Amino acid sequence: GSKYVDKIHIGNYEIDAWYFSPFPEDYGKQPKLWLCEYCLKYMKYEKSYRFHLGQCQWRQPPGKEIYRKSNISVYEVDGKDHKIYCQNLCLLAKLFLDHKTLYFDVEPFVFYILTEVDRQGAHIVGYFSKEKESPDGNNVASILTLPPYQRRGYGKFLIAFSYELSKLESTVGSPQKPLSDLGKLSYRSYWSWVLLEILRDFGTLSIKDLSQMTSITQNDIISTLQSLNMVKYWKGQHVICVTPKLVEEHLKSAQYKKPPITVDSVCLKWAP
Numbered sequence: 001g002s003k004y005v006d007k008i009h010i011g012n013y014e015i016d017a018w019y020f021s022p023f024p025e026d027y028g029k030q031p032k033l034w035l036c037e038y039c040l041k042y043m044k045y046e047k048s049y050r051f052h053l054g055q056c057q058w059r060q061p062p063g064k065e066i067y068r069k070s071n072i073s074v075y076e077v078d079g080k081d082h083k084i085y086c087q088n089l090c091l092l093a094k095l096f097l098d099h100k101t102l103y104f105d106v107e108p109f110v111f112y113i114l115t116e117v118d119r120q121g122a123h124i125v126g127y128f129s130k131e132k133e134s135p136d137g138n139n140v141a142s143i144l145t146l147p148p149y150q151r152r153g154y155g156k157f158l159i160a161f162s163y164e165l166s167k168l169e170s171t172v173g174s175p176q177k178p179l180s181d182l183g184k185l186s187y188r189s190y191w192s193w194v195l196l197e198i199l200r201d202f203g204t205l206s207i208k209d210l211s212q213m214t215s216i217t218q219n220d221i222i223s224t225l226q227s228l229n230m231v232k233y234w235k236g237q238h239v240i241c242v243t244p245k246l247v248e249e250h251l252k253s254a255q256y257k258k259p260p261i262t263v264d265s266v267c268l269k270w271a272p
C-alpha cells in the first residue's frame with residue numbers, strides 16, 4: 001500500500017485529486033504536490049516550491065499564442081517541441097480524468113492551453129490535447145477544465161475551440177471516448193446550441209450540410225437531433241423535422257442556452 005497523490009497546490013489553489021495519476025512513488029508519498037502554475041514543474045516540498053517561484057522566469061505556457069481576445073489566450077504546444085512540459089500537463093490532467101491514456105509519450109500530440117491573463121501572467125484554466133494525425137477523426141484526445149474553473153463556460157469554450165480548429169482544417173471530428181460525465185453534458189449542450197442557432201436562422205439544409213457547416217460528425221448531429229426530437233426517420237434516412245417555434249422553445253432552456261464565453265474566430269490566428 002503506497003500512497004497516491006491526493007492533493008496539489010497550483011497557483012493560489014489547492015485541489016483534491018479525483019483519480020490515480022502515475023507520478024513517481026516518492027512524489028505520491030508526500031502530503032501534497034506543488035506545481036508551478038507556468039512551467040508545470042511538480043515539486044515535493046513547500047520549500048522547493050517557494051524557491052522555484054522566485055527563480056522561474058516563465059509567466060505563460062510555452063509554444064505559440066494562437067488566440068488572444070481580451071484576457072483570454074490559447075497557447076499551442078507541440079508535444080515534440082516541449083516534451084517535459086507536456087508530460088507534466090498530462091500527469092496533472094490524469095488526476096482529474098479517469099480514462100486518459102498516455103502521459104509519457106506525448107510526441108504524437110499537440111496541446112491547446114486555455115489561459116486567463118492578468119498582470120502577473122497567463123494562468124492555466126484547462127486544456128485539450130489532439131493527435132497530430134487521427135485515423136478515426138478525433139479532433140480531441142483528452143479535454144479538461146481544472147475543477148475550480150468548471151461550470152463557468154471555460155469547458156464549452158474549449159469544445160468550441162476544437163471545432164474551430166476542425167473547420168480550419170476542412171474536416172469533421174469528434175472527441176475520443178469515453179467522455180467524463182461532465183464531458184458528455186458539455187458536448188451535448190454545445191452541439192445542441194450550435195445546431196439550434198443554425199436551424200433557427202436558416203435555406204433548408206441536410207444532415208451532411210450541417211456537418212459541413214459545423215465540423216460536427218453526422219452521427220453526433222443525428223444523436224443530438226434525436227434527443228431534441230427534431231428528426232424524422234423515413235425508410236432508413238434521418239430527415240430534419242424542425243418546427244420553427246420548438247427551436248425557440250429549446251433555446252430558452254438552461255441546458256442549451258448560449259455559453260457565456262465564445263470563440264471569436266477573427267482572434268484565432270491558425271494554419272495547417
Ligand SMILES: [Cl-]
Nearest residue numbers: 014015016147
Ligand atoms: Cl478541491
Ligand SMILES: [Cl-]
Nearest residue numbers: 153154155156
Ligand atoms: Cl462549460
Ligand code: NA
Nearest residue numbers: 011123124125
Ligand atoms: Na490557474
Ligand code: NA
Nearest residue numbers: 160161163164
Ligand atoms: Na465553434
Ligand SMILES: [Zn+2]
Nearest residue numbers: 036039041056
Ligand atoms: Zn516554473
